[model samples]
Target: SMAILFAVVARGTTILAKHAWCGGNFLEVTEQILAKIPSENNKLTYSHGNYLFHYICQDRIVYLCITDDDFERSRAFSFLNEVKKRFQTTYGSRAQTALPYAMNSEFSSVLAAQLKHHSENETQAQVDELKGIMVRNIDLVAQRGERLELLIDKTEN
Candidate 1:
């Protein structure tokens, strides 16, 4: 089965909110990737042995989703995109550098519930319902490839 190991929102090198489906030592590695995002791009696919990392960057706030090698790229990215929308809508441009454990706890529950609902084969009914929601929201997903350039323009004093 495909598993969503974790999802996170990071600004520069700082993690804001993190939600994990599977539990283990991940923050150290996730933070390392978050730090590199601003230097690289909006979408990245990296792998270490059996583990895979798929991440998307929006407005310098990185949304990362990790899964195993067997996970499809579109599935992971689409999931990350959905989380990004939810996150920005929840907290628009908030200047938070770190998320409290309580916040992480709250966010992770939502992530886990979504993951569970989507991954269950028996729940075809619910999955079909969400397919439309995801499709309808695709227009809301934005690619911030110019984010760094825009930041440079704003910061060039």
Candidate 2:
């Protein structure tokens, strides 16, 4: 159940897209979690039951992903990093601009497709083969999500 359930991109104080797996408002709680992160930290992983809520802050943009407890911690972070990079490239300085054009054209669909495909194991082989680089040695990735919080604290500079 390492499937990635959802992803969201929030810039500064605005929740841009829902791309989340759940069909409810994650705004209030997401914002709450965001607020709890220390200013010095850029990443945080909150674990509950069999789910892990992962977050990364970079360039004033917040990338959040929710996945099952089985998901690889490094892959989750790498995915967030990838999304952040793509968002920055697509929006550039406009991420701060208040334009109708201030949006990533492919953000929604890309997130959707990834979620849809990962939901079923039919394409798992291709996925692993495709992302062999990132998924490799993922077994060595920590199984406990709590360490992610400490890992980010020590690694971020």
Candidate 3:
């Protein structure tokens, strides 16, 4: 089994699960996935500098990921190229920073879905809320990264 979350193409099935190891948006889902496994064997896989969390089942790792790239591959992933270009044009440049978590398509999609849910005014608000939170979390992660950078700079000097 690939994962129970995202629609993936592995072993002839769509399996792409996402887990936000840190508290905030996808933290609950990440926790649920962890619950499915045994903690004794899992242990404290990774605490991510007290900023993020992670779980590992052998090679498979689940952790926090945040990015404002907006590389959302919804229904027509085949046409995603065109969409990506358009988005880049509209949003200036995305995927500007490389965070330790490293957000993926599914992670972006999950956050989008979450923001949709939070959008009560829109019928498709559910997914809107998901996207909203995803963006917010991305920004939060970016800010955290900035702080990390400053700390590193201070230590380097």
Q: lDDT of all predictions, in order shown?
A: 0.58, 0.57, 0.27
Candidate 1 lDDT, tens digit per residue, 39-94?
Answer: 34456677654567777777777778767667665666667767777777877767
Count clashes in each candidate, considering only residues at least 3 apart in sequence or on different chains. Answer: 0, 0, 21
Per-residue accuracy of model 2 over 1-157 as CA lDDT, tens digit each: 3267667777655656546544433444456555654444366677744567777767666778777778766666667766777677876776665432245355776666655554544235424533422211111113353222211111221
Candidate 3 positional error at 103, Å: 10
Model 1 score (lDDT): 0.58
Leading candidate by TM-score? 1
**Model 2 misplaced regions, further than 4 Å:** 22-25, 38-41, 98-106, 116-157
- Give the Å error, residue 33, model 2: 1.9
For each of the candidates, the C-alpha root-mean-square deviation to the true structure, in angstroms, is 13.0, 10.9, 15.9
Ranking by lDDT: 1, 2, 3
**TM-score (C-alpha, index-matched) for candidate 3:** 0.19
User: What lDDT score goes with residue 6 in model 2?
Assistant: 68
What is candidate 2's local distance difference test score?
0.57
